[PDB]
């Protein structure tokens, strides 16, 4: 009938209490899910949702216990990074011709960027020709950009990589799909598997094979699940590589940006900083090497998440300056500004924010007096502005643009990283009575750039950038249980979670979800069976462009109203946020 070959593959909403005896709860991927510690969320203030938060993000190392998926301390995941940084040897050995590549969609494709630099510095400082490079869903504007519906075309994904693989002779290729879902990589995969002889792909992200992404892509016959299931064969062969440790649900379900685009990197720098400093000291990547590398990784989530308190009370006040209708600044040098923007412009697709809400500065990218002039001038009583950068970095630009932003907000927090026993210029520094100093115990590194030193800097950043916006709206009320209900729909993959999340809410059938939300989207048009059967990213092209979709389509499924009755019922109730939960009663 009309829509069958659409939406086939969804599972039917299970009947109450038999959600997981129905077998649905095992279908939805890792990725996905709910995390249990989440349940509140909502309800969490600001040192609980930094507490559950940072509990979330430290089961990344939690071990694997006795029929289980395996995580990233097991075994086969650190064999399987060793023959990867040994692939990546072959490739150091033999620059002319070789080529690495770091590709992904979203803060996928942003993780993979700044690590294709860090290397790339790596081998400046060693005077060697760089060999990384990045592919982003949507081109390199993507990479501080939100453009969510770039990565739904593998032949987008393909041509990009035909691009940058020129005349090469090795490339390999790491394809970076948290849910194991983005066509953009998956066709990427596909591609490289079909020209063994020059080209190497390594898969990684964070689902089992089998719950990898199988609807069907638009432009392309295979699934990504068919592509992964192939690489995995190939690995026996060491001619293809999926690294796919389980590392739990996410605080907020779905987005990956968070523990995802975190254990990307503690996944990757591993890898290739072991396979770096293992070359030119004469001897194999072991397991050994690469722990040493994950327990300090591992260290930075304790010393990170000590400083929680401080993490809450910045958190309150970028919750509070929103509150009002005020803005935040993120403003940090080299790297740890990149990622201030990287989270700013994360949070406009993550909660319908608007992009000045939370703005991110590397000094998108404006100097000292440039930014003293241009938005100096802008600043107000309730705003919050925070400061990120090391003790390494060059503080007289720094104190310069606090004292000048103190005259305008006085709520400035900071973020400050320092080896031991490094101290804090101005004694009265206060300017920030209570910081953010974090301490970072002095470690063995013999490369010049100190790059392990880096990536603990990198992604404690994040954490904390992560954990303060998320949070900030969490607060907000904008967050349903741990679901973002009222997201915008400007992907496949946002398409589903949205269904998704009507089925659950609303425990009716599949064909009813369906039914609500493709009315509210379309609305005023009706339904047809040209739309009925229409591509995913017709819907999507549709509903990006609108508000209150989903809620809507949930309030006509409660109420059992049509799309009508329903818009006139979420204008006649104070928020959406109150309409929803009370529809829900
Ligand atoms: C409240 C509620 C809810 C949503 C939820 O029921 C949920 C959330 C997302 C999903 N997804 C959303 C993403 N789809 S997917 O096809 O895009 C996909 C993505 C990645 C992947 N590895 N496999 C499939 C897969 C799956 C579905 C559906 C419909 C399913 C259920 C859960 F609670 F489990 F979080
Ligand atoms: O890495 P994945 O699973 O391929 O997802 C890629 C992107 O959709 C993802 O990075 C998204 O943009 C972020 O908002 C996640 O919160």
Redesign the pocket.
Known sequence: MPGTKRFQ???ETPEPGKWELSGY?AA??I????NPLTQDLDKADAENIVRLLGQCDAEIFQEEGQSTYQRLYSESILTTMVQVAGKVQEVLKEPDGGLVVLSGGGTSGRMAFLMSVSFNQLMKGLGQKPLYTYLIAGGDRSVVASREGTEDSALHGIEELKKVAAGKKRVIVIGISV???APFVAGQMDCCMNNTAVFLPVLVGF?PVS?????PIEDWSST?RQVAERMQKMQEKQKAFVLNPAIGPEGL??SSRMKGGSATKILLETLLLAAHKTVDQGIAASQRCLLEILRTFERAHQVTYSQSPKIATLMKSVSTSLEKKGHVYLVGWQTLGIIAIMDGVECIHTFGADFRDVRGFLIFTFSQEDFLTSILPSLTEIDTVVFIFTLDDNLTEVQTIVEQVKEKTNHIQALAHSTVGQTLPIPLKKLFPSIISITWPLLFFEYEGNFIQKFQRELSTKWVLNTVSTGAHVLLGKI??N?MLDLRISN??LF??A???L???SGQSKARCIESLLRAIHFPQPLSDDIRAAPISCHVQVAHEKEQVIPIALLSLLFRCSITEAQAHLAAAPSVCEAVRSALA
Do not use: C, Y
């Open positions: 593959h969804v599972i709860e939805v991927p990725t996905e899910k709910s849910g194991l879902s689902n719950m990898a992404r199988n609807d990504f379900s779905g349903l249980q679901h496949s993959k589903w979670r269904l998704a999340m089925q659950r809410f």
